[PDB]
Enzyme design. Structure first.
Site, PDB file in Angstrom:
ATOM      1  N   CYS A  87      -0.779  22.417  11.139  1.00 46.45           N
ATOM      2  CA  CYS A  87      -0.886  21.344  10.161  1.00 46.45           C
ATOM      3  C   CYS A  87      -0.101  21.683   8.908  1.00 46.45           C
ATOM      4  O   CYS A  87       0.335  20.765   8.244  1.00 46.45           O
ATOM      5  CB  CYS A  87      -2.359  21.181   9.834  1.00 46.45           C
ATOM      6  SG  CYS A  87      -3.043  20.597  11.356  1.00 46.45           S
ATOM      7  N   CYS A 369      -4.571  23.424   5.386  1.00 49.22           N
ATOM      8  CA  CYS A 369      -4.884  24.511   6.291  1.00 49.22           C
ATOM      9  C   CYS A 369      -4.140  24.383   7.611  1.00 49.22           C
ATOM     10  O   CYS A 369      -3.365  23.440   7.808  1.00 49.22           O
ATOM     11  CB  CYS A 369      -6.384  24.685   6.495  1.00 49.22           C
ATOM     12  SG  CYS A 369      -7.270  23.217   6.824  1.00 49.22           S
TER      13      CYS A 369
END
Ligand SMILES: CC(C)(COP(=O)(O)OP(=O)(O)OC[C@H]1O[C@@H](n2cnc3c(N)ncnc32)[C@H](O)[C@@H]1OP(=O)(O)O)[C@@H](O)C(=O)NCCC(=O)NCCS
Ligand SMILES: CC(C)(COP(=O)(O)OP(=O)(O)OC[C@H]1O[C@@H](n2cnc3c(N)ncnc32)[C@H](O)[C@@H]1OP(=O)(O)O)[C@@H](O)C(=O)NCCC(=O)NCCS
Ligand SMILES: CC(C)(COP(=O)(O)OP(=O)(O)OC[C@H]1O[C@@H](n2cnc3c(N)ncnc32)[C@H](O)[C@@H]1OP(=O)(O)O)[C@@H](O)C(=O)NCCC(=O)NCCS
Ligand SMILES: CC(C)(COP(=O)(O)OP(=O)(O)OC[C@H]1O[C@@H](n2cnc3c(N)ncnc32)[C@H](O)[C@@H]1OP(=O)(O)O)[C@@H](O)C(=O)NCCC(=O)NCCS
Ligand SMILES: [Cl-]
Ligand SMILES: [Cl-]
Ligand SMILES: [Cl-]
Lengths: 382, 389, 386, 388
Positions: A87, A369
Site C-alpha cells: 500500500c 502502512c
C-alpha cells in the site's frame, strides 16, 4: 538541490469491476502522467526518469512503468522502474525519485502509482497437476491482502490492533460514516477540481470517484463482521474497498523549477520508512510520522493536515489515539474507506491531495502502512 | 575546484554473495525466489562480518513477482533473520532489476538516509505461474498465459519476443550465426575454466535442498550440436538458437553496501568502491544497443576512457547483445565476461544485474576498474563502474 | 552519472564593518585590532547568535608591524569572544580580507568548524617606520616607511603599485580622461548611497564616527589639474583617481547550513564559488579578470547572469581595465562607490566588498567580488543572495 | 591513501642559523626559496605541478611585499602560483600545513607547498608614525614587541612560562636536565647522519661562498654552566634561563602536499599521510599547556590512544613546555623530541611548526604514528597526527 512538487494529478477512483474496469493499470498511469505534465506547464521532453508504484503486476505485460510512460508520450530515452512496497508503493516511488533528485542524478522526474484491481488475474502453479485437483489462487488475496507470516487477511491484522487498543465497532462505524460525509462534502464543494482528471472510456465519461456514493448509513451498524466471526469490529463498510486508479506528480529540483520557469506547488521537506511486527502494520505509520517530525524538529501541532491512509477506519483511529492528534485535522476531505483504495496508487494520491489542499506555508504530513509490518510517511510544506 | 563544495564520501561494497544458478525446473526449483533471497542475504551479512542488526534497509530486484506472496523483499529479509524493523522494497526494471536495486540503495546512502543496506536480486523462473483473467469464462475456451512469456520475455509494443528483437539488431550490425555460436561455446569454456580454477569460491554460497554447490547450466552443453540447432525466434535467416541465447534459471545475489563512515565505525574493510552509474533508454526493439549508451554515460562523467577498464561484465541476455556492445565500444573481447556469464551460467532475470556487479567485486585485483552493464526489456539499460579496494 | 553529490554550501549570516577613516583622520587613534574587535562584535550581534558559538577566526591584515602579538587573537579577545577560539592572521596583501573568507569557507566545507568569523583589518595611520638591526652605516641611516616598503612597492620591478597601473593604462589605452571620469563617478555613487541610507545595514558606528570619511574629501575642479604622481610626463594616475590610505575593519559570520538551522538563523547569502589567479607581478591590474573568469566558468554561469560586480578600486584604472576585458555593463560595477572614494585599508577591503554584495543584492541575485593584490595576484568570490 | 586524502610527498628544511650567525645575511624569503626549491626536487615532480603556496612567517616587517610570493617566485615556480603568508605566531608553520590540507581535501587544489620561514636576524626596530614626543622615544624591537610579549599580561613569554612552572610545580632542575637531554639528543642525531634527508645545506654567497650544513645552535652549550645561569624572566623564585629556553634563529622549511589521487597520477610515492589536526586555545598566560588540549583533540577525533603514538614532537619553546606536556599527558619521555628540539636546535618562529612535521615525516618507521604539537603566543596550540 531541494525537491519540489510542481504538479499532482490523478484519475478518478473507480469501483471493483466498475467504471474504469476496462482500463489496464498502465493506461490509467499514462492518463495521470499526461495530465500531470500538462498541469506542470513543462515540455514532456523535460521528464528524465519515472518511478511508478504498482503492487499487483502479474499479467500487466513487461515493464509496467515503461508502458505507462511511453503511452503518455514521454521520451523513448526515459528510464523507468516499477516499485513495490505493497500500500506504501506510491509514496515509496516519490521518496526514491526525491533521493535521485537530491543526489543530482536527475533534475526532473515523474513519480506516482497505478493499480487496476479489476484486472488482477488468477494464478495456477507451473508444474505437475496434483491428483485430486488444481488450485486457482486470486492474486488480490494471495499477493495483495494475505499476511505471509500469520497467514491471515490484513483485516484480521486490523482486528488484532482493534483488540490491543480497545477501538470498538461503534467508533469504527462512526469514522467510516465520517469519511463518506467528508468525501461527499469535498466533491460537492469542488475540492478535487484541480486534482482529478476525467477519464473517457471508449467502447462514457468518468469525472468523479464512484465509491463514496455506494453507501447507506442505516445498513452500517447492521453489517456482519467479515474477518472475524465473533467480537469482530471490522466490516465491509468500515474497511477500504478494492479499486482502480492512478496518480502522478512532477518532481524536480528547485533549480530545475527556476530554469524551466515553473512555480512549485510544495517542497518535499522530509520522509521516512518504519517497520514493526507484520501483524502490527496498522501502527507502523505512528513510528514513520514520528521519525519525520523528530528529524526536522517539528511537533505534532505544527502540521495543518494529516493524511493517514484509510486502509481500515481502524488504522486511522489507531494513529489518532497513539499520536494524540486532533481528529478534525486528519483525512479532512475523505480517504480510502469512502474514496476507495487502488493499492499502488494511494500513497501517491495522499501526497498529491496535501499538495492541493494545504494553504501557503502550512505543513502536511502523509502516512501509509503496508503489508509486512511496514509504513512510509512524508512531510511536505507549502 | 573553484571553491565548489567537495562531493561527499563514496558508497562501498563490503560483501557480495549469491546462490548457485539452478536450471529451469532443475536443482533449485523447489525453492521460492524469496528463500533463495534469504540465503544470499544471510550469506552477505555473514561475509561482511557485521551484526545483522546493522543492516538498515533492503532493496531486491524481482521481475516476476506473481504468486510469490505479499512483499517479496520483506519475505527474503525476515527469512534471512534480519530484524522486524528493516524497511523493504522490491524493484522491477525488468533484467536491469538487480543492478538498479544497488543504484537505488547507493542513492539512499549518498543522501545520508541510511548508513548501511543490502541490495540484490532474486528470481525463481521455475516457480513463475500461469495466469487466467478475472471475469466470465469465454465460450469456446481460454488459454492460460505463461507469465515468463507474457511479463518476462514479450515486448509490449512490437508484440514479439526478446529473441526476435535481438534478431532485428543482428541484421542491422552484421552479427552472424557464426560469431554468436563462437561467443557462446567461448562462454561455456570460461565458466568451466573458472569453476575448475576455484574463482567462485568466495561469492557462491551452497544451498541444501530437503524433501547444490555449483552452477548447473554450464555442464548443459554439446559443442557438436551447437552449429546445427534450429533458429528458435526467426524462421529463415535467423541467428539466435537455444545455445547462444541465455536460459531460464533460478538464483539470488545480495551485496552489503555502506558509507565510508559506517565502514570505519564497524571497522570493516571494503572490498570495492562504487564510482559511477547510469541508466539509458532507446526504442524498445533496440534494447541490445542500450547498454553501450549507459556505459558511455558512466565513462563520459568521471572522465575515464575504455582502456582504463580491466574487466567488463556485459550481461549475455544473448551472445549477440555482448557481441554488439563489443562492436560499438571497440573493446578488447579478451577483457569481456572472462569467467563466463548468462549464456552458460544462466539468467535468473531479477538476479543478474546484482550477480555481475558482485562478481567484479571478487575478481578485480586491487586498483582495478570494473564496468558492469545490462539491458532490460522495454529499451533500457543500466551501467555501473566500480573500483577494487 | 551516480557521482556522490556535493555537500551543503557555506552561508553568510551577517556582514558588518566599521566606517572607513582617513589617513591620520578620525579613526587614527585606534589600532587595527580595536577596529577588528568592533567589526567582529557587531557581526556577532547582527547574526543573532551567542558569541560562544563562534569556533575560529581568520582576519586579513597586511601591515602587522607594531600591532603586537597575534593581531587576530587581539581583535577576537577584544570583542569578548571565547578564550578557546583559535585565531590566525592572513596576508595576501589587498586580497587578504577576501582570502580570509575563502579559507574559513574551506574549513567549514571540511567539517572542521561549524561557525566562523572571517574578515580583515588595517590601521594605515598606525603603520610604523623601520630601522634595520645591526650597525649604523657611516654617512646616514634610513628609516623606511612600512606602508611604502611592505605595502606599495613591487619587489621585482622596484616600482610603486601606481607605476604598475601606468603600465596597464598604456597597454589598454585607458586615458587620464576615462580614469578621472571613473573617479568622479565613484565619489558621486558613494555620496548617493550614503544619503539613501544604503549602508545602514553594514556600518557599525565607532564610539565618534558614524560614516565613511573619505567620500567628502574631494574637489571636482582640482581633479583634471592634479599631478601624475607615479609618472611625470604622459602619466594618468593621480591622487584623485588612485585609492587612498585608510583605517577600517570588516567582519562576516560564516556558517554551515546545519549550524544556521541549529541556531535558528536565516542566512543573508550563499557562497557559491571562489578562486585565486596570478599573473606577472607588474600586471596585477588584470589578475581579477582571470580569477572572476575561472569562478564563472566553474559554475557554468555567464557574465550577464551577474547582477552586481564589486571590482576593488585600487585605482580607477583597475576597474576600467576589468570592465574593458570582461566586456561588462559599467552600470552594474561598483554601484555604491568603492575604494577610490571610500578608501582602501588594505587588509579590510576584500572582506568589505563581499559584505557589501551580501546586503546590496536582491533575493536570488548573483554578485561577484574581485580584488587584485601586490605580486600579481587576485582573488574572486561569487555569492548569491538568500 | 586514496582520492582526496592528504599525503606528504617530501619535507625539507634549511639548517637553523644562530641569531646574527651563519644565515643572518639571508632574508627569510630567500631561506624560503631554498626550502621550497629543495622540497620540490625531493618530491620528484615538475615545479609547474605546485598550484598554490602557504608559508608561515610571524615577523614580516621590512621583508617587502607578499613574502610567500617572494619565496615562491625566488624558487622559480611559475608566475601563476597564488601565495598567502600565514601568521599564528610559533604555530604558523604548522597552520600553513593544516590550511593547505583543507584546500586539498576540498578539491580546490591537487598539489601544494606549505611550510614556514623566519629570519630573526633581520627583524627591524620600529618608530611610530607621527609627531616625535618631546624628550625622545625608545625605538621598539619587533622581536620583543610583536614576537615575545604577551599583549594581555604585558610580560615576556618566559614569564608566562614561569606561571606554569609554579603550578604544575616544574622546578629548575627538571627543566635543565631537560635542556641537556635536548643538546645530547641533537648532537647524536647530527653525528649519526639523522638529518641527512631532512636538511639541505645553504650556500651563502656574498661580495667567496660558504656552505652552511648543520644546525648551528646545538654546539653552543656547557652542561656545567647550565645550573649556574641567572633566571632571566624573574628575579625572585625563577626557573627559566637562556639555557633552558629556545633561542632566536633563522631557518625555513617546506613540504610538498598532495591528494592521494594526485600522487598516483604523478607516479610518486608519498612518505606519510596526514591523519588529522586541531587548534585549541586557553588563557594567554597558559600557552604552555594548550598543546595538551590540541593533542587530545586529534587523538579523540581519530579514536587513537596516546600509547599508539610512536613519536612525539612537542616544540621546545621552553624545557618547561615539554615537561608540562609530558606531565599532563602522562607520556613516556623517551618517545618525545627523540632527536632534539628547539632548545638545542633553535627556533625560527614561523618555521618550527613545519620543521616538527617534516621531522616526523622522515623519522617515523612504516605504519608508525607521529604526533606534532606546538604552542603559540596568545594561548593557542596546533597539533597534527601523521602516519608514515
Ligand atoms: C471487505 C471486503 C472483503 C468486501 O467484501 P464483501 O463482504 O463481499 O463486500 P460487500 O459489498 O458484499 O459488503 C457486505 C455488505 O456490506 C454492504 N456495504 C458495503 N459498504 C457499505 C457502506 N459503506 N454502507 C452501507 N452498506 C455497505 C453491502 O451492501 C453488503 O450488504 P448486503 O449483504 O446486504 O448486500 C473487501 O473490500 C476487502 O478485502 N477490503 C479490504 C481491503 C484492504 O485490506 N486493503 C489493503 C490495505 S492494508
Ligand atoms: C531459447 C528458449 C526459447 C528455449 O527454447 P527450446 O529450443 O525449446 O529449448 P531446448 O533446450 O529444448 O533447445 C532445443 C535444442 O537446443 C539444444 N541445446 C540447448 N543447449 C545446448 C548446448 N549448450 N549445446 C548444444 N545444444 C544445446 C538442446 O539440446 C535441444 O536439442 P534437440 O531439439 O535436438 O533435443 C528459451 O530458453 C528462451 O526464451 N531464452 C531466452 C531468454 C531470454 O531472452 N532472457 C532474457 C534476456 S532479454
Ligand atoms: C596617491 C598617494 C601617493 C597620495 O598622493 P599625495 O600627492 O602624496 O597626496 P596629497 O593629499 O597631498 O594629494 C596631492 C594633491 O591632490 C589633491 N587631492 C587628492 N585627492 C583629491 C581628490 N579626490 N579631489 C580633488 N583633489 C584631490 C590634494 O588636494 C593635493 O592637492 P595640492 O597639494 O596640489 O593642493 C597615496 O595615497 C598612495 O600611494 N595611494 C595609492 C594606494 C595604492 O597604491 N593602492 C593599493 C595597492 S594596489
Ligand atoms: C633568553 C634570551 C633573551 C637571550 O638573552 P641572554 O640571556 O642575554 O643571551 P646570552 O647568550 O647572553 O645567554 C646568557 C648566558 O647563558 C649562557 N648560555 C646560553 N646557552 C647555554 C647553555 N645551553 N648552557 C650553558 N650556558 C649557556 C651564555 O654563555 C650566557 O652566559 P654569560 O653571561 O656568562 O656569557 C632570548 O634567547 C629569548 O628571549 N628567548 C626566548 C625564546 C622564546 O620565548 N621564543 C618564543 C616561544 S613562546
Ligand atoms: Cl527502462
Ligand atoms: Cl598571489
Ligand atoms: Cl590562537
Amino acid at each position: 538541490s531541494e525537491v519540489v512538487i510542481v504538479s499532482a494529478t490523478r484519475t478518478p477512483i473507480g469501483s471493483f469491476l466498475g467504471s474504469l474496469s476496462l482500463l489496464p493499470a498502465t493506461k490509467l498511469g499514462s492518463i495521470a502522467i499526461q495530465g500531470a505534465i500538462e498541469k506542470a506547464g513543462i515540455p514532456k521532453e523535460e521528464v528524465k526518469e519515472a518511478y511508478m508504484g504498482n503492487v499487483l503486476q502479474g499479467g500487466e505485460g513487461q515493464a509496467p512503468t515503461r508502458q505507462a510512460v511511453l503511452g503518455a508520450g514521454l521520451p523513448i530515452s526515459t528510464p523507468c522502474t516499477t516499485i513495490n512496497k505493497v500500500c506504501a508503493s506510491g509514496m515509496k516511488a516519490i521518496m526514491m525519485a526525491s533521493q535521485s533528485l537530491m543526489c543530482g542524478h536527475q533534475d526532473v522526474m515523474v513519480a506516482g502509482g497505478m493499480e487496476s484491481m479489476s484486472n488482477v488475474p488468477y494464478v495456477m502453479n507451473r508444474g505437475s497437476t496434483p491428483y485430486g485437483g488444481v488450485k486457482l489462487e486470486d492474486l488480490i488475496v494471495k499477493d495483495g491482502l494475505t499476511d505471509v507470516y500469520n497467514k491471515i487477511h490484513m483485516g484480521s491484522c486490523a482486528e488484532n490492533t482493534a483488540k490491543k487498543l480497545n477501538i470498538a465497532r461503534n467508533e469504527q462505524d462512526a469514522y467510516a460514516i465520517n469519511s463518506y460525509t467528508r468525501s461527499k462534502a469535498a466533491w460537492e464543494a469542488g475540492k478535487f477540481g484541480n486534482e482529478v482528471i476525467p477519464v473517457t472510456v471508449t467502447v462514457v465519461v468518468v469525472k468523479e470517484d464512484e465509491e463514496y456514493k455506494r453507501v447507506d448509513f442505516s445498513k452500517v451498524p447492521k453489517l456482519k463482521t467479515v474477518f472475524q466471526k465473533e467480537n469482530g469490529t471490522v466490516t465491509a463498510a468500515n474497511a477500504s474497498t478494492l479499486n482502480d486508479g492512478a496518480a502522478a506528480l512532477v518532481l524536480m529540483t528547485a533549480d530545475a523549477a527556476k530554469r524551466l520557469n515553473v512555480t512549485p506547488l510544495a517542497r518535499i521537506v522530509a520522509f521516512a520508512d518504519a517497520a514493526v511486527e507484520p501483524i502490527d502494520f496498522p501502527i507502523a505509520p505512528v513510528y514513520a510520522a514520528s521519525m519525520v517530525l523528530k528529524d526536522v524538529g517539528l511537533k505534532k501541532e505544527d502540521i495543518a493536515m494529516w493524511e493517514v491512509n484509510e486502509a481500515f477506519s481502524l488504522v486511522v483511529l489507531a494513529n489518532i489515539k497513539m499520536l494524540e492528534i486532533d481528529p478534525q485535522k486528519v483525512n479532512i476531505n475523505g480517504g480510502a474507506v469512502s474514496l476507495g483504495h487502488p493499492i499502488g496508487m494511494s500513497g501517491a494520491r495522499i501526497v498529491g491531495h496535501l499538495t492541493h489542499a494545504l494553504k501557503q506555508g502550512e505543513y502536511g504530513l502523509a502516512s501509509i502502512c503496508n503489508g509486512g509490518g511496514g509504513a512510509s510517511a512524508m512531510l511536505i510544506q507549502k
